[PDB]
Amino acid sequence: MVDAFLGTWKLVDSKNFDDYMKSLGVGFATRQVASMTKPTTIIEKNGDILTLKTHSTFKNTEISFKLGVEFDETTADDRKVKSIVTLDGGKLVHLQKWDGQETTLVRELIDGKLILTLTHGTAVCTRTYEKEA
Ligand SMILES: CCCCCCCCCCCCCCCC(=O)O
Ligand SMILES: N[C@@H]1[C@@H](O)[C@H](O)[C@@H](COP(=O)(O)O)O[C@@H]1O
Numbered sequence: 001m002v003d004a005f006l007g008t009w010k011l012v013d014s015k016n017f018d019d020y021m022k023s024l025g026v027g028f029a030t031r032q033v034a035s036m037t038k039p040t041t042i043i044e045k046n047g048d049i050l051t052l053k054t055h056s057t058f059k060n061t062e063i064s065f066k067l068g069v070e071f072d073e074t075t076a077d078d079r080k081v082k083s084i085v086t087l088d089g090g091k092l093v094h095l096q097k098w099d100g101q102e103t104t105l106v107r108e109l110i111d112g113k114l115i116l117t118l119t120h121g122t123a124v125c126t127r128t129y130e131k132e133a
Pocket of ligand 1: 011021026030034037039041054055056058059060061075076077116127
C-alpha cells in the first residue's frame with residue numbers, strides 16, 4: 001500500500017536540518033557539509049520488503065525492511081537504533097529508538113512532492129523531495 005512513494009526522488013528544499021542534526025549530536029563539520037548536500041532517495045519494493053537507498057556526495061545509506069516489523073539500523077550519523085516503519089494516515093512513518101531516545105522520519109505525498117519531516121527533541125525539519133522520471 002506503499003505505491004505512490006516508490007521511485008527516485010531528489011532533494012529540492014530543506015528547512016531546519018541543522019537544528020535536527022545538532023539535536024542528534026552531529027558535529028559542526030558534518031552539519032556544514034550536510035547543509036550543502038542534496039541526496040537522492042530511492043524507494044523500491046519487492047513483495048512486502050521495502051528498500052530505501054539514500055545517496056549523496058557525502059554519506060550513503062541503504063535499509064531493507066518489512067512494514068510493521070522491527071529491524072536493526074545504523075544511521076548515516078552512526079547511531080545504532082531499533083527501527084520500525086509503518087503506514088499511518090497514508091504517511092510512511094519511520095520510528096528509531098536508541099538509549100531511550102526516539103526520532104521519527106515521516107514521509108507524506110503532498111501535491112506530488114514527497115515531504116520528509118524529521119523530529120528529534122524539539123527540532124522539526126522539513127525536507128522536500130521531487131520525483132525523477
Ligand atoms: C545519506 C545522506 C545523509 C546526509 C546527512 C548526514 C548527517 C546527518 C544524518 C541524520 C540522519 C539521516 C537524515 C536523512 C535526511 C534525508 O534523507 O534527507
Ligand atoms: N554499516 C554502516 C552504516 O550502518 C552506517 O550507516 C554507514 C555510515 O554512512 P557512510 O556509509 O556514508 O559512511 O557506514 C556503514 O556503511
